[PDB]
Design a protein around this ligand. Sequence first.
Ligand code: NA
Lengths: 8, 90
Amino acid sequence: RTRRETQL
Amino acid sequence: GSVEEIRLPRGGPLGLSIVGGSDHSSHPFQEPGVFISKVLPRGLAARSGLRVGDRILAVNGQDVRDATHQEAVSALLRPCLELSLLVRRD
Ligand code: NA
């Protein structure tokens, strides 16, 4: 899989 | 464990970071679901009680257990006065 962090 | 509903007052930034979804890896934690990877110290999320680790079960009553990352993001940015997040901790 692909990690993905979203800062909000 | 524990479950908690957190009411966040609100346009500007939440001061949290999410990982996960039905479409991405929870690299820090193959646990399924959307997870708070990071909490801006002294940010909106931090103050309101949110915590690194918390899994997001629902945003303003929308079940996001099985959400994609984008869907969870969408739901977290929908415009609202009160952002209500149901989370599981531990
Ligand atoms: Na709607």
